[PDB]
Design a protein around this ligand. Structure first.
Ligand SMILES: Nc1nc(F)nc2c1ncn2[C@@H]1O[C@H](COP(=O)(O)OP(=O)(O)OP(=O)(O)O)[C@@H](O)[C@H]1O
Ligand SMILES: [Mn+2]
Ligand SMILES: [Mn+2]
Ligand SMILES: [Zn+2]
Length: 383
């Protein structure tokens, strides 16, 4: 933690991709003061941070970042006035006006359905939860909502971010943002609630398409890697999600089966035979779906998405607790993404001078290229 200042100084002098970063947040320069009215928040040493920083142009930003060498950089909203002048604005008039629609997913929120890790830990046996979250959420944002400019980022420790940047998305009210979150949400309830997913008789297309994404991964992820029906301590958590009247039958089949793969097939058969409503003679896989969703469906840090003023860690910021760079994720290679290959600031600083001095000589290069593909699409969109 004491090595960081020396490494941050080199990173901000030679490696941070300022020209791409400004191309992003200047959004083509079409709207007056759009970059100059952006809030940045810097974290310095000792968990000290400063709100309502703002800059005139790219050179101003470079100069201040290289003077302050912040441990962490957060991006906030675009305001009605220059954030660094907000004390000169008559009270009430200083207001957030626009910001990307953002999402923050934390693997810690899955601890009740992860067996390998807890707290801020992640590993390859649970990272597939993030793979499924990206695929489910991105499909909905692209296909259901028609949002065209979506930047997915590794947060540097325990999950992923998404920045939705279409010009009309950036104008969305907090009320509408909340509505989008609710559309995307299915897992509800704190630690007091055992069963967190309840489906209606007729499933909405968003739910069907999300289930079908999970189905591609569920065997390798849940039955093999997580081994969720390995033994009675594991399979009891799953029985807590179905009606008691079928526990006995499932108990006996689980003990007569040899592995989670076999026990899952038995659960599906029993669940599709359970009579929910005694009026009708209607049967279905609702229970099977609710279990798969509770174990695999994205769990959003909702408050991050709902408020237009909310800060979020910048892409290409360091995560001070791991040293990892928050790098963009290539959507065409999301299944290949390894968070343990993500370069730390120490690692790329070593590369930079190991035997011109910019990021192209380091492992950061491919991540900047993903960023540039996203910036090019934004440029095309503005023609
Ligand atoms: N006290 C705080 N005051 C303010 F104003 N913003 C905060 C605070 N704390 C966090 N924020 C922002 O809320 C994002 C998500 O908070 P969080 O999920 O823990 O962090 P990260 O996703 O970046 O990193 P991971 O460890 O999860 O991988 C962060 O980026 C920050 O912009
Ligand atoms: Mn997070
Ligand atoms: Mn969070
Ligand atoms: Zn794990």
């Amino acid at each position: 933690p004491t090595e960081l200042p020396e490494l941050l100084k080199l990173y901000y002098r030679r490696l941070f991709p300022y020209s791409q970063y400004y191309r992003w947040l200047n959004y083509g320069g079409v709207i007056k003061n759009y970059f100059q009215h952006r809030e940045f928040s810097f974290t310095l040493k000792d968990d000290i941070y400063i709100r309502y920083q703002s800059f005139n142009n790219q050179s101003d930003l470079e100069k201040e970042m290289q003077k302050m060498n912040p441990y962490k950089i957060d991006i906030g909203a675009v305001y009605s006035h220059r954030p660094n002048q907000h004390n000169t604005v008559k009270l009430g008039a200083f207001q957030a006006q626009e910001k990307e629609l953002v999402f923050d997913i934390d693997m810690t929120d899955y601890d009740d359905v992860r067996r390998c890790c807890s707290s801020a830990d992640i590993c390859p046996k649970c990272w597939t939860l993030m793979t499924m979250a990206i695929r489910i959420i991105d499909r909905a944002l692209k296909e259901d909502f028609g949002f065209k400019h979506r930047l997915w980022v590794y947060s540097g420790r325990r999950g992923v971010h998404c920045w939705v940047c279409d010009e009309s998305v950036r104008k969305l009210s907090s009320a509408v943002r909340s509505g989008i979150v609710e559309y995307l949400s299915l897992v509800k309830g704190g630690q007091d609630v055992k069963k967190k997913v309840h489906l209606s008789e007729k499933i909405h297309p968003f739910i069907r398409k999300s289930i079908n994404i999970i189905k591609k991964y569920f065997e390798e992820y849940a039955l093999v890697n997580q081994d969720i029906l390995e033994n009675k301590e594991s399979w009891d958590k799953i029985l807590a999600l179905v009606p008691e009247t079928i526990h006995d039958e499932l108990q006996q089949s689980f003990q007569k089966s040899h592995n989670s793969l076999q026990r899952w097939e038995h659960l599906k058969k029993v669940a599709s035979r359970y009579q929910n409503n005694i009026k009708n003679d209607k049967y279905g896989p609702w229970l099977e779906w609710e279990i798969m969703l509770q174990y695999c469906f994205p769990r959003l840090d909702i408050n991050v998405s709902k408020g237009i003023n909310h800060l979020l860690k910048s892409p290409f910021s360091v995560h001070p607790k791991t040293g990892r760079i928050s790098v963009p994720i290539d959507l065409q290679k999301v299944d290949q993404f390894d968070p343990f290959t993500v370069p730390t600031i120490s690692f790329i600083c070593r590369e930079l001078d190991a035997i011109t001095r910019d990021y192209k000589k380091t492992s950061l290069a491919p991540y900047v290229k993903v960023f540039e593909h996203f910036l090019e699409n934004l440029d095309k969109s503005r023609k």
